[PDB]
Structure formats: C-alpha cells, structure tokens
Amino acid sequence: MKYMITSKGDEKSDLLRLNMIAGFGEYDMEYDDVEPEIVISIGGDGTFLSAFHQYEERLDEIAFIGIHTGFYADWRPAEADKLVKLLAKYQKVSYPLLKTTVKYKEATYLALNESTVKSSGGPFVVDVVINDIHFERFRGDGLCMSTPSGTTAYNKSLGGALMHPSIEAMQLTEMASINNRVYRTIGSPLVFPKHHVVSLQPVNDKDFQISVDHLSILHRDVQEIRYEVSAKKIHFARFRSFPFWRRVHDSFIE
Amino acid sequence: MKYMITSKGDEKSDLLRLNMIAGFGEYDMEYDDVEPEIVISIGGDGTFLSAFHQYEERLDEIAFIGIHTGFYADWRPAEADKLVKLLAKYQKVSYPLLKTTVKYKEATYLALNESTVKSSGGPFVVDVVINDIHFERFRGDGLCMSTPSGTTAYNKSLGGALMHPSIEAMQLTEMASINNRVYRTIGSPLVFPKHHVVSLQPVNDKDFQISVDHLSILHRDVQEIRYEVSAKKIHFARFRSFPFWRRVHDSFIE
Amino acid sequence: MKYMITSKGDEKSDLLRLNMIAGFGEYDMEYDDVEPEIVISIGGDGTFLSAFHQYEERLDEIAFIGIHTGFYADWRPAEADKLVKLLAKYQKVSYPLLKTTVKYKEATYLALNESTVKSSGGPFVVDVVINDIHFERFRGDGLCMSTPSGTTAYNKSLGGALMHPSIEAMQLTEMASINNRVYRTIGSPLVFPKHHVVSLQPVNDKDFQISVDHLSILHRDVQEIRYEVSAKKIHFARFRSFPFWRRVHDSFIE
Amino acid sequence: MKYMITSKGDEKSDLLRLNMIAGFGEYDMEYDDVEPEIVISIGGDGTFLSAFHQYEERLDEIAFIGIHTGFYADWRPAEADKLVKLLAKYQKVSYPLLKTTVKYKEATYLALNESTVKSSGGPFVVDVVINDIHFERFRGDGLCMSTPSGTTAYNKSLGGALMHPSIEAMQLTEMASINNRVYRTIGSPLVFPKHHVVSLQPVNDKDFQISVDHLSILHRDVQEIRYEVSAKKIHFARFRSFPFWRRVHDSFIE
C-alpha cells in the first residue's frame, strides 16, 4: 500500500524511520506522503498530533499507526519489524473528532484532543448557549471542549471525566470560574452527544486565544465559536488487542 | 388508558391526586395500580424514585409523568388540568438504566439514579476490574456508579460530569480515595459505554453497604458487584419541549 | 530517663522493640509504661496514633519518637542503635492538637489527625456555627476537622490544603455536600485560628457517627459538637533536621 | 486628620465622594492625597486594590476604609454620613501581605490578594523550591500564591482553602497541572507560615507572565521568583464588628 512515516526529529526516531522504510522495500509497499493509505507516526503524542493534522483532509482514506520512542502511539520501538510484517499482509477502529467553527469569513478546525478558548488579556467572558438556549455566562480563565480520546489530556487536568472513545460525544470543562453573589456557572463538566451545538458568544471583549490541539492562534473580532461532534472520524490500524482502559491504567496507575 | 397516581403523602400532594382522579373520571381513563399504562408521581424526586421501583418489572409497558409540588418531576401543580386533557387525547422519551448484580444466590437491582458501595465499618477496599482487566485497587470511603439522568444527583456532588440522558452510558466516581506512596487510584471519573462490565471484587472485608437509589442494605459475604448499562429503559410521557440542559440550568444556575 | 516502647505487633516490630530495650539497658534508661518521659512507637502511623492516645493525659511531660518498620514515624529501623545512643546523651518540636467537645454529660476528645462527623444512617444534616454566628446549613455525607499535621491524611483526600504544623490552626473540609436551588454550602475548605469555635448543631436527626483519629463511636442524642484548637500540644524529640515539606515530598512526590 | 478619597469613576461614586468631602469640611479634617492618614475607597474591590497600591509605600501610617457602591469595602453607601461622624471623633485591624521578589536588577512587589505566574506562551514549567529544598517540578498553566484575605478571590476558584486573615501565612495553588507517568505535582494547596521562602526557578523558558493583584506584566529573562509573607501589613479602620466569616457568608452563602 501507499504509506508514509513522520518522525519526531531526534536521532532515535529518524533512524527507526529509515529502518522501517528499508523493511517496507522488501514488500509491496510504496512510500508516498501525498496520498498515503497508512500514516505511521514515530515519536510522542505531539508527533502523532502533527501527523493527524497533516492529513486531516483525507482522514476517511487513511489508517494511523503510532509508535512511541504514548496514548495515540501504542507500539514499542522494538516491535517495529513485527509491525512491518503485520502491515504487509488488519482491523480499523475509529475515534470521534471535534469540529470547531469560528465566525467573525467563517473558519473551521478539526480536533483530535480538544479545543480551548482563553482571553486575549484580561478576564475571559462568554455566554454559553446550548442548542440556541442560554445556559450560563462564564467568567474566568477559559473553557475546554475535549474529544473522548482527549479526555485523558487537558480535560483530565481540569477535572474532567475520562470517557471511552466508542462514545460519540464531547466534554466541556471550566478553567478557574469565578462564583460569588453575582457570577454563577455550573462548575461540573458537561458531556454532549452528537448534533448538540455549544455556542460561545462574546459579551464585550471580542479577541480570544483559540487553541486546536497543539496550535494556538489569537483570533480578532470574534462573533461566535461553535462546538459539535464532527461527522468525520480518525481511523487507527489495530493488529492486537490493547483496550482503552488498559492504556489508561498503564499511563496513570502503574 | 389504565393509569395510577402515587402521592408524596402531604396535604398538597394527596389533594392534587384526588382532583386529578376526578378529572380523569370525565374521560376514558381507568384507575389501576396493578397494570397501569401511565404512572403519575406527585411530590419530589424521591417520590418519583419510589414510583419507578414500584413498577420496575413492567417498565417497557409504562410511561412515567412527574409533578413537583424536580428533575424527574417536570410539571407544575397548576398545570394539572392541562395535563389531564393532554393525557386524555404524546411522545415517549427513554432514559438509560443501571444494572447492579451482587454475587455471594445472585441478586440483581435496577437503578434510575445510581448505585453506591461503602464499607460496613472500617476502610472500604475493592479491586476494580473493567472487562476482566484489573484497573486499580480502590481504598477509601466508597464508589458511585451513576446513570446519565443520575449525574446531576450524587454523582455531581462527588465531582462527576453531567451527561445528557441520550448517551447510553454509566459514570463511576470516587468517594475520598487515599493516594500516597502505596495507594493509587485514577481519581478522575470514568464513563463507560454499553456492554462494558465494571466488577468490584473484595480484598479482605466482604461486608458492604450497597445502595440503589434511595434504598441502602447491608450485604454480607459479598464476592462480586457487577455494574453495566441495562438493556431496560424508563419511558417518559412528554407533552412539551423541556430540554435536559434547560432543566439543568433551572436547577443549578438560575 | 523513664521510657517505654509500643509495637505494631508483627515480628519485625516486636523484635526491634526487644533489641532497643536491650541497648537501653546499657545506659541510664529505665523502662516504665506508667510515667514515661520518652514514648517510642514502632510500626506505622496507626501505631503512633495509638501511642499518642495511650498517653494523652501526660502530653506535656512526654516526648514522642516514631520508627516506621510514615509521617509521625520519621526514623528508619536500621537507625535504631544510633537513636539509642542519641537518646541516651535533644530538641523538642510541638504540633497543635484539636479539641472535640460533644454535648448531649459533656464528653471531650483530643485529636492528632482529625475528627469527623457522619450520619447514623440517612442524610447528614447539621447547622455550622462559627463563633455563635450561623455560617451555613450542611447537608451531605459528613464533615472533617483536621489538625495541621493531619492535613496530609483524611483532609488531603477530601481536597483540603496541606499546612505547616507551626501554624496553630484547624481545617474543616466537606464530604459530598449537595448544592442546588435549595441547599448551599461554602464548598471550599475553611482554616480557623486559635480561639475560634466551630459548633455543629443538629437539625432533626440527633445520632451521629463521630470519629477521633482511628476511633469511631456512634453518639446518641447529640446536642452540639464543638471544634477548637486545643491549648495542649504533642511534643516530638528531634535529633536531626527533617523538614515537614521534605516529609511531604517523600510521601507524595517521589 | 489628613485624609483622601479615591473613586471608582462612575456617577454614583464620584458624587458620594464629593458629599463626604463636604461633610468632612464640617470637622477638623484636612484633605491630602500626598500624606493621608485615612484612605477611603469608594467603588469595588478593584477600586480598593488601586488605593492600596497607590499608598503601598506608607502603609504603616495609613488606615484604609472601603465603601462598596465587596470584601475590602465593608460599608454601605447610605452609611456614609455615619462614617463621617464616626471618623471625626477607632480600632485598627491588620491583614498580612505577600512579598514577591523577581530576580533577572531585583524587583519587589507587594500583594494584598495574590501573585500569579503563567507562561509567556507555551507550557509553564518551574521548579518549586521550599526553603532551599526542591519540592516538585511544576508543569501546567500556572501557580497562584495568595494572602489570607486573598483566599476568597483567585485562590478560591483554583480550589484553595479560605483562611482567616489573623493567620500570618500564604497559600499556593495550582493551575491545571499535568500528572501522568512522567510528571507529578502535589496537587493539594500548600499553606506556608512566616519566614518560609517559596522559590520558583525556571527550567528552559525564562519569560513569564507575572501578576500582582490587578496588574500583569511580562517579565523577560527571569532567574527566580521568591514568595514570602511580608513584614508589612495593611491597616483597616474598624468602627463596628463585621467578622471575616460573616463577610464570607454574605458573599457566597446568602
């Protein structure tokens, strides 16, 4: 098949990439970083994140594989040759994604971990509207909308719940909300199903720091930020069983 | 249709029940508390909880309606006559339920809010096993497994996330877990999809205080406590739009 | 000096106790468990807790030393002989204590870690009164009032802050408080200085499960539970520097 | 006495200021905003914060009074005339302050609420050193060191404990710390007594966003940030009893 390999950039990842390419040359495998059918990421979760966004316009035609030299990298470097033979002769598991829409022309972004909004300096104030219904006025440091696979990332440090990636949903968590006689927020994290639209609408300041996974851009003259579960999904190539809860156990428990 | 009405027991609920029965007598409505097709609960969430368990063996043939004199009671007392006329001439919305299985003969319970486990005196210690995989050893005050509609109840006070009832899932939260050099738990709440089985297995003490909604019984010589999303669902009769997030807003925000 | 040694009860602690007694026989040391001036605890924090309560009526005349075979046990077993020689030929550091007063005859208890109140079955409801001022009505699972040295124990798992033992204060934390349209608590932990009196007063149910360190007794017909920083302090014998924050680091960080 | 009045700037505060000045003209009161002995702040907590920093070099010779048109403003506007007569013919209560020292020439700042450190873009990473002892390596969004009176502000939203202002201490809370297999922080808030020095030392990035109450400046080429309880205190003029816990009750409970 058409494949490609991205590298973290250090010595260990660059050379593991060159050796896997050599082993692929002994099979009917064709290296192509323009229309690959397999995208292999060698490095960390940040490296895998970059590979996903590099090919986010052909997600429905690509299967991702991660090698940590990680959550999205569930393959050890010493198992590379077995991964070569396994890939040459698999099942695809799909994780949900988050669609972020920023209105001012409209701009849309796709997220594998989460998308967060913070102030451009000063207090962060937005009205939270759930399906055209005003739910709360948030005043604090920011908000974070996470995918299921992203719940073990930023969402976890903010007190969010960890949810299995088979659940097509998104989770919204708060960043240091003020709560007194005049300001009131739900405080608890919120989990939204598909087709539920969460709209963040500015009150006074219209400039916000908007992040999508590892990217963070200052957005000027913002009118609306819409969050919803994307119809697009990321596809993983799975050769062996590695349950999500076991991956959670190995990363945080023991 | 065959209907029945349960009452909180105070003067306001008992008399609202008698007046609704009188109005039902002016239509083709038959009072029957043995095989009712409509169960009307008048009181609070605890009153509705008792009505659900009173007819938990005929859930697939009953539509519940709540009147608060509440979360499950989404009808004001002054709207009773309109509810009578509306019911006489609706759509059914279904919420997921939690199945609790206690092994020692096996005992099974059905939950609308949550099921919790605490110690029978002393430290509460159980091994948490997710799909036959040992995830953690919990040592603390207890654990709480909540339905989606139950996430705004006990689950919320324990730091759990609020999730929409259209998501067929269950959420597990901790009660004062100890975490030091020797004891380690995930800390974050966990959200499980259907067909995922969470098994709590004792370590030394085998007596536990097990709750199912408002009931709490001491269980002796416990070998296993299994949690899973039930295949059974509770059915509500809906006459007007009242979104779950608006019900959340009115109960906690304003 | 007059000394005594208490043991955890296992083989390792019983024999380390007998060997230290033998080494003490080579100095001007007199074993006496009635009027000891040095109390050596060999085991864990629970063992040290029992030694403190065993001699809580002569605290101002006793210096405690802990050996973990721990927080209050800051001596390794292999350093026992050096501890014998050091003790034979020190500085005393003092930690604050918590006074608990239960009115119904009045009963008073002294705490090194904390004192907690829970319900005797059903919801736990008390009015919280701070210096004769009604601060809140607590409805939930319980409350915990911790000493400074106790903040790394139960208080920590409840979300309480860790505070240095040189601060003469007490910290109150919540256990799963309900907060909605009708019930409201502060949520945050509260730190009280000396001479501040925190009074918990029942509303309807008068039976409570009251704990003091490792002891837990059901108290019937309770009228008031008063918390205040005790004028009595526990005295430690210190031979080397071991800062509290380093003890915190070694127990939770690395 | 020599007095001065600062105003929020809106119509209600500007005119209440002019009327109080007129009433002061009927007594032996001299307006002086260079060497005032009484500083009256009319507005909100942010207005009072500006008055404190306006005269932070003569704190030991000034008594502050707050009027909310608040926590530091504990006087209603309708009680202004009584405040004029009361002031003409009081007791001083003192609150502790936080000293922040930034090394690169050395720069020192005084805080009434708190001082926070965040990254200049990217991850915030500092080593936390308590009394020349490495306690942890913090990686996350930031850290917050609060005074006692500041614990009800930013510290509260970050999960910090509320402590009485008579306790000469400072409290450190985390902002979204990452905790996994490689990163580990204490998580709990830390309360430090006087003479304890908390040093934050950079790891790689040396630019930080440092805040002191309402001011926030980007600091370049930072080598150390030292936190300690200041020897300086702010002095309030008190005419009637208004306990701190009652002020907490009125602001968050009812």
Ligand SMILES: Nc1ncnc2c1ncn2[C@@H]1O[C@H](COCC#Cc2nc3c(N)ncnc3n2[C@@H]2O[C@H](CNC(=O)c3ccccc3C(=O)O)[C@@H](O)[C@H]2O)[C@@H](O)[C@H]1O
């Ligand atoms: N305050 C916060 N606390 C926790 N996480 C935060 C966060 N602020 C952003 N993030 C996160 O940063 C990610 C970008 O990096 C790649 C990744 C990944 C990543 N995905 C996951 C995942 N699905 N599940 C579990 N771990 C993950 N990781 C692990 O995240 C760590 C990487 N991050 C940081 O160390 C980091 C921490 C704090 C601040 C900045 C960074 C930073 O580097 O930017 C690595 O160990 C990865 O293996 C963003 O997507 C935010 O989720």
Ligand SMILES: Nc1ncnc2c1ncn2[C@@H]1O[C@H](COCC#Cc2nc3c(N)ncnc3n2[C@@H]2O[C@H](CNC(=O)c3ccccc3C(=O)O)[C@@H](O)[C@H]2O)[C@@H](O)[C@H]1O
């Ligand atoms: N520590 C805890 N903190 C918060 N909740 C706790 C909890 N311990 C159990 N629960 C809960 O008690 C429920 C039994 O009661 C009927 C109900 C209901 C109920 N359902 C819901 C719901 N789906 N969503 C939102 N609110 C709900 N409510 C509201 O819950 C309040 C009732 N409870 C208590 O006041 C209460 C609080 C503390 C302790 C005991 C009780 C008690 O009464 O037993 C009422 O306002 C209801 O309207 C159990 O199912 C546990 O969920």
Ligand SMILES: Nc1ncnc2c1ncn2[C@@H]1O[C@H](COCC#Cc2nc3c(N)ncnc3n2[C@@H]2O[C@H](CNC(=O)c3ccccc3C(=O)O)[C@@H](O)[C@H]2O)[C@@H](O)[C@H]1O
């Ligand atoms: N839900 C809770 N979560 C955390 N702690 C809780 C707690 N419920 C009570 N406690 C606590 O139990 C203590 C009685 O035990 C001796 C001690 C001690 C003890 N002091 C301290 C301390 N100053 N600083 C740091 N660690 C300490 N320890 C360490 O506490 C662990 C002992 N406890 C348990 O394992 C335990 C955990 C959960 C439930 C029950 C027990 C139990 O055994 O009763 C051991 O590792 C000790 O070294 C009570 O004083 C409550 O503070």
Ligand SMILES: Nc1ncnc2c1ncn2[C@@H]1O[C@H](COCC#Cc2nc3c(N)ncnc3n2[C@@H]2O[C@H](CNC(=O)c3ccccc3C(=O)O)[C@@H](O)[C@H]2O)[C@@H](O)[C@H]1O
């Ligand atoms: N994420 C956070 N969550 C909570 N607080 C935060 C915070 N980030 C900074 N702060 C805080 O902002 C303060 C500057 O403002 C004057 C004051 C004061 C102030 N002192 C206190 C106090 N001792 N006790 C109780 N309330 C206080 N207040 C009340 O704080 C509210 C003012 N603040 C904001 O609304 C605000 C909220 C979020 C974000 C920005 C702002 C902002 O305006 O900058 C007003 O109601 C005041 O009455 C800084 O000192 C940070 O403590």
